[PDB]
């Protein structure tokens, strides 16, 4: 059968264990998540211009009764219900947030003559919906300043729903961001982007229903709104360690925290309200040092130290602390404790992973050895909803020591699909493997079962009995998972094994991409077969941005060098970056650009075309839980 | 049996394949490695002050006949013999190197009144031995300037064998280094240092004999000299993109290449000789993006681009190119080709790994899919002696996507020792596993055998038959390995499985360590059991360096904050950094320091002691190829 199964007796026992181990009697977050509520609109439905649905919360109604469901980790279900506390909220005098209109919060700070807005959600429709809620309840006021707390799409993505380029060009609207914003906003999502995006369908459970045996929450929010990604460049950057500014009468201190949750990030202190906005450094969950979709590993040490810096600068005077995800904390003592514990949470994960590692504990072992001490374990905002202790400890270890466990048995490993046949033969064949796996399954050993049955799936990807048992065990692991990404991953893997994989660009984002990175990405697109034995060089001049690049294709590799031209280039191309962007977005033809006097050439006029024709594409729905089709 | 076996028929066939695939007819390196030879001292033996042996080459005599040995990859044996071309060499007029006195080269550039020296080898005795060779052959001249090409111990480690602090303090001797030198010199070897050091015994094959069935070479040199590590701080730093200086009459251009082979590194162009010293950016081998001992992953993209920058700045005029490992290349056309190919080598590894990854190829697969194109494959300096294509492709992938293959079967893996019993049971028990493994072994399937028998070793680490078969298969893989680190690793793993693991600090290095890092490392040493439930804070003042730190132990985590003091610290300690260093090196007692007026306290005088008593140690010889003892 290819539908979700009930929680097994072992999964039920594991949920009961969670209830026995975690302080469910501490219900204060429920009072925190409702504090200062102005308006929870009855039934949220946000639509995009093209008529698609950006966001809705109706699929979560199953959670509203608060009745325990054994196909959901009870700690996750707690978080799931808390993230359902949406609407417009007062945080402190003249400080409001709209929560639950998207993954992140949007923050409205009352200036003398209009709003200062922190962050803008993921897509313009949710930002616009949020601003309309604000206007209906608090009165319409112009937005004078948008601040990006950090360079993530769930923060800058909805900006055009709030402001238009004309307002920025006139100086009617300022956009403030931490230094390094533009570099970080685009960079990490590019070179490995297709891999990340596809792996992200698992993390986000994009093919799962909302329900008790599908997607229930995304830890830092319910989920990510769907729609166009927008991005408007900052007009002012917060440099160095930070800056004090006054915006529309309101004093702001920005504290840069480069290289924590994002390469470009800053906390915001508001001395008049004694309000401390901890960007995404401190949220209602342990965050990712490594996000499973795939990314660079984050620096827990810097993260801890920047939280400590904020603690000693502001925490020591804060009356309310709030963030760009989840709900605020009020009370200086509570704030001081949350700051210390989150500081020590990242500090501990970092230091104790390395302590274990220096004892010889490997990347393959550390998650089964490292445990938070009670003082850190027993806080809800320390729980592994978004990041997990498990995968973060492996991440620290990977950061310092890399992927290889130091055991040469694993140094030159056969691909899973090339060793799988022999695993299966050594275990007595598929039928025998399944027999033994089913007995294991019957003992609740799902972490083992998914390991060993995965071998048979990789040996025999059409073996329907193997896929369905693998799926069953993964699903129990999903039910069991406190971590929303782990849950979604497990259930998505079960979905694809049971059903198969599906068989049916942002202009702003491209505009924000550095030219060197763009050509780095084209070099990633290069088909090595097509490039072999070729050599060509092209001077590229982009006059609107006053940049020249030398492009050199040689030895099946595309090079680009900023600020260099070669007298020996076969071709020299002059084209505005804006027009190159249109070209790569298919919004204009190369021929038309030439006719408009927008794409110019000397030398061999064919080389750039030849280079473009060597560029391959990537299919999105690549296989994950079986070998390639 | 517990001694090395002959190469098997399959290993013999694999060596013959190497000979068929690689351009052994291209012997020019042999003429390159001998070019400009002034003196090869007959029998090199370098001794440390304490009477230990720093370095000798006599153990390599087996290689001198040049006779093929089937227990050595023939491509590696070629490299092994070339790295034996030691002694004093002329590179170009007034430019000399001593090669083969240590892992790296030391370079002597004739100034008007003395030497400018680039790098200093690993330990003072080898540097001193090298300088004596130079003085005997070329005449003694004072060293006026030492330049560190980059922040690695095989480059700065032998500095006290050349110069003394007094000469630096008087301005008699300048030390020039790339900006970021001091930060990088110590940093990466610290927090994960014990793990790295122990894993390094495998990479370096420190327990292997020199011989055909042990250690034969270390790719970028024969091996690493043994002895005290010294480090003297630079007196002048090369800032920004680089600088042009004149040293003792000789013009130098330094080209910073931060974040390639090292975070702090620079190439050196010598316009008078048209000599281009490519630091360790370009050496006679593919280098590591990830060094198996364990380290941060290096940036192949920046590495490629910095090589391209050097190509277009200098390569275009160079007459000789040489490096801090291996031998020079002469001839502008040859230099241009080596620069392009090395640029495209790192570029290709980077771009094609990501191309494959964006197609869904995982970290567990990519090394079995990615292959260099012939133009890059067929050069000796592109061969995987030091880095390997295999482990570097996985490294690129790990850098962008992390350790996790995206398949949730592998998301929450049991430790090898916790799943091993079940692998063994599913395969019919130890005796049955061994039977099937031996049949596989007999078919030459060593990469499979080491995978599956490793399971039995982890289930039954005292199973002598399992250990010996595992060892046998690993050893054949070692014989087969072109990569010196892979070879050494495989043979070391075979050594420890057959024999077991052994059952029986640098003042300069500690001095060079930032105070924050030092306390970061103490926090790594913290025993979490001892720390639990404790809280203490200490203001630490270090007046010789004019630095204050706030130390806070809470929630089983030690925090330190630079430039902060707390009115609520339980204790305030004032101590010179120099004296703290002595204390941690056990060169002085805390009591004596107090008596000398060197360690001062107010508040609770017990806290610092309490904090120190919570600090654990790490045993060096942890298990790698079996579960912990
Ligand atoms: Zn973020
Ligand atoms: Zn966010
Ligand atoms: Zn180096
Ligand atoms: Zn080196």
UniProtKB/Swiss-Prot annotation, chains A, B:
UniProt cross-references to PANTHER family, sorted A to Z: ALKYL/ARYL-SULFATASE, ALKYL_ARYL-SULFATASE BDS1
Gene Ontology BP terms: dodecyl sulfate metabolic process
Enzyme Commission number(s) from the entry: 3.1.6.21
Protein name in the entry: Linear primary-alkylsulfatase
Gene Ontology terms, MF aspect: identical protein binding; linear primary-alkylsulfatase activity; metal ion binding; protein dimerization activity
A Pfam family: Lactamase_B
Domain of life: Bacteria
Binding-site residues for sulfate, renumbered to this chain: 288-293, 298, 386
Cofactor, free-text remark: Binds 2 Zn(2+) ions per subunit.
Predominant location: periplasm
Cofactor(s), names only, from the UniProt record: Zn(2+)
Enzyme class: hydrolase
Residues that, per the record, bind Zn(2+) 1: 150, 152, 261, 280
Acyltransferase keyword on record: no
Annotated compartments: Periplasm
GO CC annotation: outer membrane-bounded periplasmic space
Disruption phenotype: Insertion mutant cannot grow with SDS as a sole carbon and/or sulfur source. Disruption of the gene leads to a decrease in the growth in mucin minimal medium and a reduction in the degradation of both carbohydrate and protein moieties in mucin. Mutant shows reduced swimming, swarming and twitching motilities and decreased mucin gel penetration ability. Virulence of the mutant is attenuated in leukopenic mice compared with the wild-type strain.
Gene name of the encoded protein: sdsA1
Swiss-Prot/TrEMBL domain comment: Contains three distinct domains: an N-terminal catalytic domain that contains a binuclear Zn(2+) cluster, a central dimerization domain that ensures resistance to high concentrations of SDS and a C-terminal domain that provides a hydrophobic groove, presumably to recruit long aliphatic substrates. Although separated by the dimerization domain in terms of sequence, the N-terminal and C-terminal domains are spatially directly adjacent.
Inducers of expression: Up-regulated in mucin minimal medium.
Catalytic activity: a primary linear alkyl sulfate ester + H2O = a primary alcohol + sulfate + H(+)
Family per similarity comment: Belongs to the metallo-beta-lactamase superfamily. Type III sulfatase family.
Function noted in UniProt: Alkylsulfatase that cleaves both short and medium-length alkylsulfates, including the widely used detergent sodium dodecyl sulfate (SDS). Acts in vitro on primary alkylsulfates such as decyl sulfate, octyl sulfate and hexyl sulfate, but not on sulfated sugars and arylsulfates. The hydrolysis of SDS allows the bacterium to use SDS as a sole carbon or sulfur source. In addition, contributes to the in vivo virulence of P.aeruginosa by playing a central role in the degradation of mucin, a glycoprotein that is the primary component of the mucus overlaying the host epithelial tissues.
Residues the record lists as binding Zn(2+) 2: 154-155, 280, 325
């Amino acid at each position: 059968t290819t539908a979700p199964k009930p929680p097994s007796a072992f999964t039920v026992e594991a949920q009961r264990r969670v209830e026995a181990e975690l302080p469910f009697a501490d219900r204060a977050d429920f009072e925190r998540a409702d504090r200062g509520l102005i308006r929870r609109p009855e039934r949220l439905l946000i639509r995009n211009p093209d008529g698609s649905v950006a966001w809705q919360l109706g699929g979560y109604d199953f959670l509203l009764d608060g009745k325990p469901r054994d196909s959901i980790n009870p700690s996750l279900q707690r978080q799931a219900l808390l993230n359902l506390k949406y609407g417009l909220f007062e945080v402190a005098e003249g400080i409001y947030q709209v929560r639950g209109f998207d993954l992140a919060n949007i923050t409205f700070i009352r200036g003398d003559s209009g709003w200062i807005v922190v962050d803008t959600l993921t897509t313009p429709a949710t930002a616009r919906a949020a601003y309309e809620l604000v206007s209906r309840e608090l009165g319409e006021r112009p937005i004078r300043t948008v601040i990006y707390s950090h360079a993530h799409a769930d923060h800058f993505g909805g900006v055009r729903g709030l402001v238009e380029p004309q307002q920025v060009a006139s100086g009617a609207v300022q956009i403030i961001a931490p230094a390094g914003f533009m570099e970080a906003a685009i960079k990490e999502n590019v070179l490995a982007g297709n891999a990340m995006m596809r792996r992200a369908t698992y993390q986000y459970g994009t093919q799962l229903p909302k329900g008790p045996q599908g997607q229930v929450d995304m830890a830092i929010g319910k989920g990510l709104a769907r729609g166009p990604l927008s991005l408007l460049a900052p007009t002012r950057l917060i440099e160095g360690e930070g800056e004090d500014l006054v915006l529309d009468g309101v004093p702001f201190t920005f504290q840069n925290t480069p290289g924590t949750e994002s390469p470009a990030e800053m906390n915001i202190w508001l001395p008049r309200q004694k309000a401390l906005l901890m960007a995404e450094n401190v949220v209602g969950t342990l965050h990712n040092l490594y996000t499973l979709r795939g990314a660079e590993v984050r620096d827990a040490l810097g993260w801890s130290k920047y939280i400590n810096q904020a603690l000693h600068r502001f925490g020591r005077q804060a009356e309310v602390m709030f963030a760009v995800h989840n709900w605020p904390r009020w009370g200086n003592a509570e704030i001081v404790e949350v700051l210390e514990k989150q500081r020590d949470l990242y500090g501990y994960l970092h230091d104790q992973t390395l302590h274990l590692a220096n004892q010889g504990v490997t990347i393959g072992q550390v998650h089964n050895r490292l445990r938070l001490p009670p003082s850190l374990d027993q806080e809800w905002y320390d729980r592994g909803y978004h990041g997990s202790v498990s995968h973060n400890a492996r991440a620290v270890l990977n950061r310092y020591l890399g992927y290889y466990d130091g055991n040469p048995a694993t140094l030159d490993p056969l691909s899973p699909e090339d060793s799988a046949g022999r695993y299966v033969e050594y275990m007595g064949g598929a039928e025998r493997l399944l027999e033994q796996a089913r007995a294991s399954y019957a003992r609740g050993e799902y972490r083992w079962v998914v390991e060993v049955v995965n071998r048979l799936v990789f040996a025999e990807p059409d073996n329907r009995a193997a896929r369905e048992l693998q799926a069953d065990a993964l699903e129990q692991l999903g039910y069991q998972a406190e971590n929303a990404g782990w849950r979604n991953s497990y259930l998505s893997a079960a979905y694809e094994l049971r059903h198969g994989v599906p068989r049916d660009g942002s202009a702003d984002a491209l505009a924000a991409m550095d030219t060197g990175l763009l050509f780095d990405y084209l070099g990633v697109r290069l088909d090595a077969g097509a490039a072999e034995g070729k050599a060509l060089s092209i001077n590229l001049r982009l006059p609107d941005i006053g940049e020249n690049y030398l492009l050199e294709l040689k030895n099946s590799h595309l090079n680009n060098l900023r600020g260099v031209q070669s007298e020996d280039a076969g071709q020299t191309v002059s084209i505005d970056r804006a027009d190159l962007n249109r070209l790569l977005l298919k919004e204009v033809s190369a021929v038309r650009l030439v006719f408009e006097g927008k794409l110019k050439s000397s030398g061999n006029p064919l080389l750039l075309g030849q280079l473009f024709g060597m560029l391959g594409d990537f299919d999105f729905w690549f296989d994950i839980v079986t070998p390639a089709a």
